[PDB]
Design an enzyme around this catalytic site. Sequence first.
Site, PDB file in Angstrom:
ATOM      1  N   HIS A 131     -11.630 -28.190  24.640  1.00 34.27           N
ATOM      2  CA  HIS A 131     -12.492 -27.569  23.619  1.00 34.27           C
ATOM      3  C   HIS A 131     -13.945 -27.822  24.058  1.00 34.27           C
ATOM      4  O   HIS A 131     -14.619 -26.883  24.472  1.00 34.27           O
ATOM      5  CB  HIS A 131     -12.094 -28.093  22.268  1.00 34.27           C
ATOM      6  N   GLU A 177      -4.764  -9.887   3.228  1.00 37.30           N
ATOM      7  CA  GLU A 177      -3.781  -9.978   4.301  1.00 37.30           C
ATOM      8  C   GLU A 177      -3.939 -11.197   5.179  1.00 37.30           C
ATOM      9  O   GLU A 177      -2.937 -11.597   5.793  1.00 37.30           O
ATOM     10  CB  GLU A 177      -3.835  -8.681   5.140  1.00 37.30           C
ATOM     11  N   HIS A 213      -0.529  -3.071   4.935  1.00 37.23           N
ATOM     12  CA  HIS A 213      -0.928  -1.700   4.762  1.00 37.23           C
ATOM     13  C   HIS A 213      -1.783  -1.159   5.905  1.00 37.23           C
ATOM     14  O   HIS A 213      -2.958  -1.449   6.021  1.00 37.23           O
ATOM     15  CB  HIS A 213      -1.747  -1.572   3.429  1.00 37.23           C
ATOM     16  N   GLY A 258      -8.045 -22.606  16.132  1.00 33.36           N
ATOM     17  CA  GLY A 258      -9.282 -23.068  15.543  1.00 33.36           C
ATOM     18  C   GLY A 258      -9.806 -22.112  14.482  1.00 33.36           C
ATOM     19  O   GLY A 258     -10.917 -22.306  13.973  1.00 33.36           O
ATOM     20  N   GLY A 276       0.791  -1.189   0.000  1.00 33.46           N
ATOM     21  CA  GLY A 276       0.000   0.000   0.000  1.00 33.46           C
ATOM     22  C   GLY A 276       0.834   1.254   0.000  1.00 33.46           C
ATOM     23  O   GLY A 276       2.065   1.196  -0.014  1.00 33.46           O
ATOM     24  N   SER A 277       0.162   2.414   0.031  1.00 33.14           N
ATOM     25  CA  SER A 277       0.891   3.663  -0.207  1.00 33.14           C
ATOM     26  C   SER A 277       1.873   3.981   0.922  1.00 33.14           C
ATOM     27  O   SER A 277       2.943   4.521   0.680  1.00 33.14           O
ATOM     28  CB  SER A 277      -0.085   4.783  -0.465  1.00 33.14           C
ATOM     29  N   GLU A 309       3.596   2.020   2.471  1.00 33.81           N
ATOM     30  CA  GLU A 309       4.645   1.004   2.437  1.00 33.81           C
ATOM     31  C   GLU A 309       5.579   1.168   1.260  1.00 33.81           C
ATOM     32  O   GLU A 309       6.674   0.607   1.244  1.00 33.81           O
ATOM     33  CB  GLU A 309       3.938  -0.324   2.394  1.00 33.81           C
TER      34      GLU A 309
HETATM   35  C1  LIG Z   1     -12.805 -17.759  11.104  1.00 34.20           C
HETATM   36  C2  LIG Z   1     -13.752 -18.787  11.618  1.00 34.20           C
HETATM   37  N1  LIG Z   1     -15.092 -18.628  11.426  1.00 34.20           N
HETATM   38  C3  LIG Z   1     -15.979 -19.555  11.877  1.00 34.20           C
HETATM   39  C4  LIG Z   1     -15.537 -20.718  12.513  1.00 34.20           C
HETATM   40  C5  LIG Z   1     -16.510 -21.770  12.975  1.00 34.20           C
HETATM   41  N2  LIG Z   1     -16.262 -23.079  12.346  1.00 34.20           N
HETATM   42  C6  LIG Z   1     -15.909 -24.211  13.192  1.00 34.20           C
HETATM   43  S1  LIG Z   1     -15.821 -25.623  12.200  1.00 34.20           S
HETATM   44  C7  LIG Z   1     -16.759 -24.832  10.969  1.00 34.20           C
HETATM   45  C8  LIG Z   1     -17.187 -25.641   9.707  1.00 34.20           C
HETATM   46  C9  LIG Z   1     -16.052 -25.807   8.707  1.00 34.20           C
HETATM   47  O1  LIG Z   1     -16.642 -26.564   7.615  1.00 34.20           O
HETATM   48  P1  LIG Z   1     -15.719 -27.408   6.649  1.00 34.20           P
HETATM   49  O2  LIG Z   1     -14.424 -26.740   6.411  1.00 34.20           O
HETATM   50  O3  LIG Z   1     -16.563 -27.668   5.440  1.00 34.20           O
HETATM   51  O4  LIG Z   1     -15.422 -28.756   7.406  1.00 34.20           O
HETATM   52  P2  LIG Z   1     -16.419 -29.889   8.043  1.00 34.20           P
HETATM   53  O5  LIG Z   1     -16.794 -29.364   9.414  1.00 34.20           O
HETATM   54  O6  LIG Z   1     -17.605 -30.020   7.104  1.00 34.20           O
HETATM   55  O7  LIG Z   1     -15.579 -31.128   8.103  1.00 34.20           O
HETATM   56  C10 LIG Z   1     -16.863 -23.508  11.163  1.00 34.20           C
HETATM   57  C11 LIG Z   1     -17.485 -22.495  10.246  1.00 34.20           C
HETATM   58  C12 LIG Z   1     -14.111 -20.776  12.781  1.00 34.20           C
HETATM   59  N3  LIG Z   1     -13.611 -21.759  13.507  1.00 34.20           N
HETATM   60  N4  LIG Z   1     -13.267 -19.837  12.301  1.00 34.20           N
END
Ligand SMILES: Cc1ncc(C[n+]2csc(CCOP(=O)(O)OP(=O)(O)O)c2C)c(N)n1
Lengths: 524, 524, 524
Positions: free
Chosen positions: A280, A46, A69, A400, A24-25, A27
């Site tokens: 978890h 990003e 940026h 996650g 970006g500018s 940078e």
């Molecule tokens: C940035 C983000 N947004 C939302 C989630 C919530 N998330 C947990 S698992 C999941 C489903 C992912 O689906 P996929 O990649 O198709 O795999 P599957 O569960 O069908 O095996 C989501 C959206 C997350 N962990 N991170």
Amino acid sequence: ASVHGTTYELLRRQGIDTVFGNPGSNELPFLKDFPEDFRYILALQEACVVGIADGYAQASRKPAFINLHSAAGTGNAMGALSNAWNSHSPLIVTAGQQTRAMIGVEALLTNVDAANLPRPLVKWSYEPASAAEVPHAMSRAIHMASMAPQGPVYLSVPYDDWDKDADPQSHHLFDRHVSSSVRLNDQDLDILVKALNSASNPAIVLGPDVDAANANADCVMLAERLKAPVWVAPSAPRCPFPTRHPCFRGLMPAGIAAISQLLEGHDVVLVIGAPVFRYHQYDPGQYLKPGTRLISVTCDPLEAARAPMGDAIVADIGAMASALANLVEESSRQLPTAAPEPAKVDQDAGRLHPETVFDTLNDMAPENAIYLNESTSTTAQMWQRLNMRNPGSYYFCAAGGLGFALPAAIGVQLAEPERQVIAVIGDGSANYSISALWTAAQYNIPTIFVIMNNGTYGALRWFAGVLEAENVPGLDVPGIDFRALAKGYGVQALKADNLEQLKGSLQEALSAKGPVLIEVSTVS
Amino acid sequence: ASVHGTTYELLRRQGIDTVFGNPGSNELPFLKDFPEDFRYILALQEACVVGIADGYAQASRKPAFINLHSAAGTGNAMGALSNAWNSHSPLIVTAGQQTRAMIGVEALLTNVDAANLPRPLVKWSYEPASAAEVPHAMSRAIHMASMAPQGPVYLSVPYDDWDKDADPQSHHLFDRHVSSSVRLNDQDLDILVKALNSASNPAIVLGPDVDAANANADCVMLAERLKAPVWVAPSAPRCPFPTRHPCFRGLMPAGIAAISQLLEGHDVVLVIGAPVFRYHQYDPGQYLKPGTRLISVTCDPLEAARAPMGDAIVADIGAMASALANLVEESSRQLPTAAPEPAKVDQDAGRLHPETVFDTLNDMAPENAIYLNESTSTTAQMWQRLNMRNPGSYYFCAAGGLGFALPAAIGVQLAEPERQVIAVIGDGSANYSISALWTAAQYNIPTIFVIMNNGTYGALRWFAGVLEAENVPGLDVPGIDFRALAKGYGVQALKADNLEQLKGSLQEALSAKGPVLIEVSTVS
Amino acid sequence: ASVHGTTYELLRRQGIDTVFGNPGSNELPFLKDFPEDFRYILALQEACVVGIADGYAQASRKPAFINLHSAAGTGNAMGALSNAWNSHSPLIVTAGQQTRAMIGVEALLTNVDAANLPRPLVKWSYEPASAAEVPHAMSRAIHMASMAPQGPVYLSVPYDDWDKDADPQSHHLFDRHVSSSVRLNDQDLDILVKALNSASNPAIVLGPDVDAANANADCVMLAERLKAPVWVAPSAPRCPFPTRHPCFRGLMPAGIAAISQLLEGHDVVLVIGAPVFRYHQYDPGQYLKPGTRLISVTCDPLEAARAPMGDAIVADIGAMASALANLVEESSRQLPTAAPEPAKVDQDAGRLHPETVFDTLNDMAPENAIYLNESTSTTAQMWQRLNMRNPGSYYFCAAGGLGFALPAAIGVQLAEPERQVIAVIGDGSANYSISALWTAAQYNIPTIFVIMNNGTYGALRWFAGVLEAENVPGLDVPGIDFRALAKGYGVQALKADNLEQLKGSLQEALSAKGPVLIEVSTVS
Ligand SMILES: Cc1ncc(C[n+]2csc(CCOP(=O)(O)OP(=O)(O)O)c2C)c(N)n1
Ligand SMILES: Cc1ncc(C[n+]2csc(CCOP(=O)(O)OP(=O)(O)O)c2C)c(N)n1
Ligand SMILES: Cc1ncc(C[n+]2csc(CCOP(=O)(O)OP(=O)(O)O)c2C)c(N)n1
Ligand SMILES: [Ca+2]
Ligand SMILES: [Ca+2]
Ligand SMILES: [Ca+2]
Ligand SMILES: [Ca+2]
Ligand SMILES: [Ca+2]
Ligand SMILES: [Ca+2]
Ligand SMILES: [Ca+2]
Ligand SMILES: [Ca+2]
Ligand SMILES: [Ca+2]
Ligand SMILES: [Mg+2]
Ligand SMILES: [Mg+2]
């Protein structure tokens, strides 16, 4: 010398020769006169920039340098920083700021209160008070990222600083060596070793900082000497142990009650390079059953402080694992028996069971392949079905946060050109950082992307069933053509609607000289 | 068990038996049913509370526990926290919050955004999300304060949490042992030792973390083995070395050019337990002269990262000093020659030169006295004129923040009942935390307070002269009767208008069984 | 022009001519060449500095300018900032920083991450990125403090900036006029007025922003027109209404159930210039009883957002009160009947009941006296027993943070030289900012300090009884000689052990030309 020249010398002298960026500018004055001995790796968004850098850093076991940026670019990367924090990834995140004369009026492109933007996801965050301070601030960033516990840092630089004169005394920065390669003092180490030698039924739990330290082989020797079963700590971002070693017992379920049950009967549990524990699911119960003592070796004070049980030692994982492996006695107990082979799931000529996919990958991939996982409903099966003999063979979004694996697989492949990288990514997850594919095409980084397409956010559907939650919106993602997306970013695309096509596609992907995406039709 | 009962058991089990506090309404539910085996030390203002706790922690070499009232109480203590951060003082700062049901409406006594209030002066800052988490949060606080690099932490607790049921699984917190007693791995330690053995003209610089670690005696052995001169790093918060040992060279001036000149000709300079460096005055020049290599051992990553020169090792100072002292060769060079005796400044029968005061203290005080300094224009002379043979013998506000020494001297005296504490405090500095005197009276803590009264902020007058600054307001503090202030808080008061009266007053103070303040008329 | 010259011109042009400060080294380059038309008011500790400035600002109804020393000085003032935030006090808090060249190394006196230090207690917090930005940053500070809702702000300035050349374009800053003197649009204002006119039993509740706006007289007209009783909102920092006006109903108890009961039967309750509500004690129940509608006029979005009930309008209190007073109909209902005279509590020839003290003050003090309250167990009686006819006649620590009243009474007296200020302060509270007394002596600011000495933290003893809390430590403060403390700081001191002595002492204090402290022996 200018601030620009001094800063690039510092970076070179400290081993940095690659910039991962989206320009970006603010940078351009940093990026101009880009040194001929440096590499710039462009990504189109990003989150992708940082993901790629993260994979590169994790695999290379050294800091990665990023240029984003201002506020908007930094902000687009903050989900990627959430993962990097949890994986202790040494990332030097730089962002350009407006010219100092225009900061007060908050001109467009001003990063307001810049050092607070990436908090709390960085170890250190800073904007220097003058141009001549920039090299020193950069030195701080390099070392803060690189010292144990490693992690991301952030530096904002007003764009007019680069052309200013540097302080000649900045030369003292170039060759500074900063070590945190420390281990427990001899007296207390001897106490620990005696506790391990005297255990009647020890167990070992390993986390990602073992793989980051390349302490894997030392942990193998430690487990063989103690004749102890070895688990990977839950929510595993990396693989710290050979998964077909006789001592290996796999991924721990991420639950309080489940882990204390697994550890029942083990009088001493030695945890190395993991938080205690990255639980978890809700699974209330005892942290440990009566009869189990836990001892944790961690590189991170924050881990040691929050563990709800056990003793802890804060030290470098490489140094501690090497010392322990070489000091413990050889137990006369029998070596644990290897886990049995996983079952073959019945597979018709239709859509693929995920088990089938993993079994086929394990059958066909080279022994030194590197896998990434962002197929969230299939993790347990993946861990059971891939023989990962070598360090640096597995990566999973450490917080996650989806959108890691696709760009990180590119960075890992860049870091390990002789090791075939195979990213196994759900159809949902694939979208978060889809534009990263373009970087693989442009730089011809031959990652293989395996898209597990079942049309849904399967892990969320599963959890909704566990909660007995009805009427949850937004769980399905029909209507995505991943071959068309691959074509969109210049990546060769293949389909696999059945096992025969999966084998054929993987054979073609494995021989390809460029990146390949395979869209696999998996069971709903 | 209640949260109250579990938390006090945790504290007891972790070695805490004293609460330094100023109470308020949000804290009564914590303070009620106060355990019979705990001590409460009341001070009348929170800068005093924290100062006292700080002195206690520094001298005792263990965490001190504090209880303050919400935002206003915490806020009154934040200058004291500035010093505690710089001295790596392990302080567990707790503050009460409103009842959870009244936080949203921001009832009076609500600490809004509480965890952000003490930042950036704490290692960790937190408000738990539920009552049952409080013991775990307290455990985190204890360990975060206590792990290297030690420092203050903050915990805010809604007052209704204390009476709630605790989690039975909190018992796993009670006996957790967390160690950061680490040193450089053997291979790299051997390299360091060889560099020290091969040096032709080594020098040693020691900072406050040596005294905190009680590494003083090991550093003496190290300096004797290397036949090296030893300096105290600038702006010294503590005294890390016997000040009449032949190797001792005193306090380094806090300037870039002055330190590089002092180190000129020394081929290896080993810095232990200090920042590199806590400069103060503007004194531009070279960080090091050609020919000098610097190596720093620090307990603090932030120190290692910001050093503008030299290699660094991040490790426990006690472990590293012991290892180095026992591994280096005995050099055949001649032991350095002791510094000469300081000159006797001419003294008439009138107001006292500060040199006179220090010489008389050194003549009359016991050999195991402990000194505190908050006489800002006389520090250099103090360091030259007091023979401090033992560890734990000197304290100075580590951030330069006035209001430390008067309360800290009370805390030090509480920590070391057999060692006479003598606080030498300017008339300006004495006011900041004047109400601390009351705690000494009430608990009969027999600190001696020596007020150096010259009617002015002398260090500021001096600096104004250096700047050639005219017409600076606010530099004079006439019209303070320190004997009357002492009487106000129940402390015996003496005057010394000349040398004969100084000797007489000090003889009476040294024999007194309670605290004593001596107002000394010093030269303007 | 230098940055120094431009900044002082800005301040002068914006109406600032007084600096409240405690100096330090980072501030000398700002304070040198101090303009002959400015006043510097020194205080000996920064809680005192800020308290004095706060009283001055509140009474003067204009911003007050403060200069503190770096982090330690700012930190010592943060309890005072807690009160200033709650009272919407327009305070411009400046602190000096190290020279820009020494910030990176964190030299002594460096304020690290400076803008985060006073958060969350300031509206705006900033360190400029260059010297030429300083005047602009100062302009921002002035306006941020001064715009509705008023409040404290913070500006950190590296000391080397002052001597640098200013931007000539900074002249556009000098005469900027920024107004927030706004009121509800005509259409919606007419709706509100009709709701008030149609109410069958309206009530009015007033908070501190009425007094800050000098909207008191308009609120009197409004209450007379609506024939409505008027209460002061709980935990009152100021007095917004004549306390013997027939409509006045006194201080609301700070409890949810108690206020909804008081308001029962009132169909419309108009709250002006207060949070809804600054509750304190736990008193669960209904926020409003059925049948009551609440409408709040507040200068503060944060107040409007957190109110748990009612409609709100965010606007200037002066503008809204004037508009409402002039638009509402004259109701034909009978004017409320004045509250009865308070009872005379029986008083023997021994220690004084607080009721006696207040009755005697009300008997002897001038009708235009100004009172401050930091006698925490006697507030309800004070509010019942002092006839306060005029605006600006009462101040109480707006966050409940002790250490306000003693310094603020000095600032109020400086602001209102023709109005006798009388601060009624408990023996506990008096210690927090005791050194402020010196400023009154040095500048001959003739505040009267009435110390209510009962030897204990009485409000805390009371609350412990309410909680049925046993074994609470730290509630007693015996052994403080307040006459000796007054002598210590050069303030005339008197005692009152009985009513005859109270009258005699107050007669002497009221005629004195300097400040006076009276130590009153009150009932335990
Ligand atoms: C940035 C983000 N947004 C939302 C989630 C919530 N998330 C947990 S698992 C999941 C489903 C992912 O689906 P996929 O990649 O198709 O795999 P599957 O569960 O069908 O095996 C989501 C959206 C997350 N962990 N991170
Ligand atoms: C809390 C705080 N406020 C202000 C200062 C600035 N300060 C530096 S030295 C000094 C003078 C102290 O005077 P005194 O204690 O009488 O000692 P002298 O300099 O006369 O020896 C002051 C006010 C500070 N360091 N800390
Ligand atoms: C800075 C600060 N610390 C602690 C408190 C808690 N506090 C509430 S009232 C009280 C007692 C004050 O005693 P005193 O001034 O003697 O008045 P009394 O209650 O006896 O009338 C205290 C310490 C507070 N509000 N602010
Ligand atoms: Ca197979
Ligand atoms: Ca490589
Ligand atoms: Ca899916
Ligand atoms: Ca002598
Ligand atoms: Ca002791
Ligand atoms: Ca002085
Ligand atoms: Ca009367
Ligand atoms: Ca005035
Ligand atoms: Ca009292
Ligand atoms: Mg942020
Ligand atoms: Mg803060």
